[PDB]
Structure 1
Amino acid sequence: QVEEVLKWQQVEFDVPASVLSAPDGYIPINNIPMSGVHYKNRVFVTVPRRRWGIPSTLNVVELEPPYPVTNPVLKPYPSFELNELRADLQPDANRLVTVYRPRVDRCDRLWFVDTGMMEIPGNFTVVQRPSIWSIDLKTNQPLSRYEIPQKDVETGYGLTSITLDVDPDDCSKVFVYISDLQTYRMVVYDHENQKSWRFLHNYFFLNPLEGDFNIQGIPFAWDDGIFSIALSNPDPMTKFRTAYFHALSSNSEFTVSTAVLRNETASKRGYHGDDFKLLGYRGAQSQSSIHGFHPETGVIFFALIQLNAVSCWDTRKPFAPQNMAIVYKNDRDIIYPNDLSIDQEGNVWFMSNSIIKLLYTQLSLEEFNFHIWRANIKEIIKGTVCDPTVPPNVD
């Protein structure tokens, strides 16, 4: 019911021996993948440059059964020419510095953010300003690029996640919402008008008492804020969407209408009134990383950090623990659910990269460290409370 599509002991690249032979050109233990998203039998895998020796930040892998496809070599997408790191480390609009979590739209486009920053522990290296890209997946050619101005974000240290707001009819009318978990802000991107602005709000912060974890016997505390945003279907009478959002270090989910997010003058305010609202409590130890809203079912899928699992929730039901169900659980293989994503084919995709092991312990290249699963949404929710045909619980 949940199949493991991809797994790695370590990450390897399809680049010239020139790059592999050069000193500190490729360090295996340094290459931690951060996302894997799906598009027509192709899975895009990112390796953010938090370390030296990372040949390509954006990558692709071709799918062929049977699964799991073991240790697939990553090919620098769209071309190694872009994923090359300049030796002079200077700004370049035709180079990809660091990419985290891309998303695929219905228009055969790949959207991502090049942070332009390398978070090497010891030497944080700001190469260039953060940029929003779109790639045509039919032609494998870059379409648009937008550099995010200083007035919205200073560096791009925390721009690790994005949510796409594409009009159902016009494929050109696109907004993008970026979650900054480091500076506790959300950056809205008007693609159509090549404009952007930023929101600041108390709800983008962590909950002081809810940033403590114990995973695989390792304890740690994080202060990471707004991390994921999930958009409902456009309202029939208003055309706007509910933005479900949460901090990494929180057991709470909050909501805001896109009408607020799409409005620049609203961002510039000192006080947002009661535009941003609390949806409610997700449960004990129910801190989530990435969550996604499946349009056809109206079901939100949560990646649960502490519980080493993936849960779901039907949006029509009241937001309550007894109205959510765990669809998958794996204490051995889910160490940190780094990414969750919903494809154009009715599947929920999720990924674990064992980052906690690396950070706080020793990762072992003998074992399989990085995993990618998939599940058919309609099939996975059938019996459960996440099924729209199943009534909510009495509590």
Structure 2
Amino acid sequence: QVEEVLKWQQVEFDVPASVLSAPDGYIPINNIPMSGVHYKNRVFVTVPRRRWGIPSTLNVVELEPPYPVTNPVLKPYPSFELNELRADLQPDANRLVTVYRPRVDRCDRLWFVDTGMMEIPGNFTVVQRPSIWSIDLKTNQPLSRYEIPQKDVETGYGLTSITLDVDPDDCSKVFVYISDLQTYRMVVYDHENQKSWRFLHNYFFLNPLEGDFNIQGIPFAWDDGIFSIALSNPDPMTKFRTAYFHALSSNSEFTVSTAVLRNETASKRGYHGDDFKLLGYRGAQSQSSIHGFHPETGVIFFALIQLNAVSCWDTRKPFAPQNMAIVYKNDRDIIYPNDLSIDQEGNVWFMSNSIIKLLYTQLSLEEFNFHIWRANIKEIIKGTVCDPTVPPNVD
């Protein structure tokens, strides 16, 4: 029902031996994949440069059964020329420094944010400013690039997550919502008018008490804020969408109309009033990392961090723990769910990268550390409370 598609012990790259032979040109243990997204027969894996020895940040893998695919070699996408890291570390608009979590739209495009910053412990290296890319997945040729001005974000330290808002009619009308979990803000990007603005709010911050975890018997505490944003279907009368968002270190979900996020004048306000709302409580130890909204079913899938599971919620039902169901739970393999995406085929994709083991213990490249799963949405929710046909619980 939920098949493991890709798994790695460590990450290898399809690059010249010149890069592998060079000193500090490739360290296996430093290469941690932070994203896995699906398109056609291609899965894009990203390796953010949070360490030294990372040949390529944006990569791609060709799917071929049987699953699970063992240690697929990452091919630098779109090309290794772009994923080449300059020794001088100087700004270049035709290079990719660090890419976290890309998203695929209906227009056969790949959207991602190049932070332009390497978060090496000790040496924070800001190579260039953060930029928002779009790639044509049909030609494999970059379509647009937008450098984010200083007035919106300083460095792009926390720009690790993006949400696409594409008009159902015109494919040119696109808005992108970036979650900064470091600076506790939301960067809005107007693709049509090539403008951008930032939103500052208290709800983007964590919950002090809900920031402590214990995974794989490893205790830790994070102060990470807004991390993920999920969009509902357009309102028939208003044409606007409801943005479900939450902080990493939070058991609470919040909502806001895109009418507000698409309003540049609203961003500059010091007080946003009652525009941002509290949805409700997701549940004990129900801290989510990434979540996505399925347009067909109207079901939001949450990547639970502490519970090592993936849950779902039918947006039509009241937001409560008893109106949510766990569709998959794996305490052995799912250490930290680093990514969750919904593809154009009606599948839910989620990933674990065992990042906790690297941070607080030793990671062993003998074990399979990196896992990617997929599950058919309509089939996984069939019997559960997430099925729209199934009524909500009485509690």
What TM-score, normalized by structure 2, do the two folds share?
A: 1.00
Q: Secondary structure at the match of 2:312?
A: strand
- Residue 20 of structure 1 aligns to a residue whose secondary structure is helix
Cα deviation for residue 245 of structure 1 reads 0.1
Tell me how far 1:10 sits from its aligned partner: 0.1
Alpha-carbon distance in structure 2 between the residues aligned to 1:140 and 1:284: 44
Equivalent residue of 1:203, what SS?
A: helix
C-alpha distance in 2, partners of 1:141/1:263?
A: 31
User: How far apart are 1:195 and its partner, in Å?
Assistant: 0.1
Q: Deviations 1:321-344 (Å, cap 9, x if unpaired)?
A: 000000000000000000000000
Once residues 332 and 362 of structure 2 are traced to their aligned partners in structure 1, the CA distance between those partners, rounded to angstroms, is 16
C-alpha displacement of 1:127: 0.3
CA distance in 2, matches of 1:169, 1:79: 32
Q: Give 1:105 deviation, angstroms.
A: 0.1
Distance 1:4 1:169 in 2: 35
Deviation at 1:133, TM superposition (A): 0.3
- Deviations 1:57-81, CA, capped at 9 Å, x for gaps: 0000000000000000000000000
d(CA) in 1 for partners of 2:204, 2:50: 24
CA offset at residue 289 of structure 1?
Answer: 0.1
Partner Cα separation in structure 2 for residue 100 and residue 27 of structure 1:
19
Q: CA deviation at 1:366?
A: 0.5
Give the superposition deviation at 1:88. Answer: 0.4
Superposition misfits of 4+ residues, deviation over 2 angstroms:
none
Return the alpha-carbon distance in structure 1 between the equivalents of residues 284 and 23 of structure 2.
47
Q: For 2:41 and 2:66, how far apart are their aligned partners in 1?
A: 13
Determine the C-alpha separation between the residues in 2 that align with 1:22 and 1:127: 21
Aligned residues: 395
User: Displacement, 1:158?
Assistant: 0.1
Q: CA deviation at 1:270?
A: 0.5
Query: 1:153 offset after TM fit, Å?
Result: 0.2
Residue ranges of structure 1 left out of the alignment (5+ in a row): none
**Cα offset, 1:375, TM superposition:** 0.1
How much has 1:124 moved relative to structure 2?
A: 0.4
Query: Could you report, residue by residue, the CA deviation over 1:277-314 in whole angstroms, capped at 9, with x for unpaired residues?
Result: 00000000000000000000000000000000000000
Q: Distance in 2 between matches of 1:125 and 1:248?
A: 25
Write the distance in 2 (CA, Å) between the matches of 1:263 and 1:86: 38
Determine helix, strand or coil for the equivalent of 1:358. Answer: helix
Separation in structure 2 between the aligned mates of residue 351 and residue 336 of structure 1, nearest angstrom: 8
Report the Cα offset of residue 226 of structure 1. Answer: 0.2
Aligned partner of 2:297 in structure 1 is 297
Instruction: Give the superposition deviation at 1:247.
Output: 0.0
Report how far residue 103 of structure 1 moved.
0.1
Separation in structure 1 between the aligned mates of residue 28 and residue 140 of structure 2, nearest angstrom: 27
Take 2:82 and 2:261, find their aligned partners in 1: how far apart are those partners? 32
Shift in Å, 1:102: 0.1
Offset from partner CA, 1:229-280 (integer Å, 9 cap, x none) = 0000000000000000000000000000000000000000000000000000
Q: In the TM superposition, what is the alpha-carbon distance from 1:356 to its structure 2 partner?
A: 0.2
Please report how far the alpha carbon of residue 86 of structure 1 lies from its aligned counterpart in structure 2 after TM superposition. Answer: 0.3
Other structure's SS at 1:175 match: strand
Provide Cα deviations, 1:366-394, integer angstroms capped at 9, x if missing partner: 00000000000000000000000000000
**Pairing of 1:230-245 with structure 2 (within 5 A):** 230-245=230-245
| CA-to-aligned-CA distance 1:334-373 (integer Å, 9 cap, x gap) | 0000000000000000000000000000000000000000
Shift of 1:189: 0.1
SS at match of 1:37: strand
Distance 1:176 1:261 in 2: 10
**2: CA distance, partners of 1:360 / 1:253:** 28
Residue 101 of structure 1, CA deviation: 0.1
Over the matched positions of the two proteins, sequence identity in percent amounts to 100
RMSD: 0.2
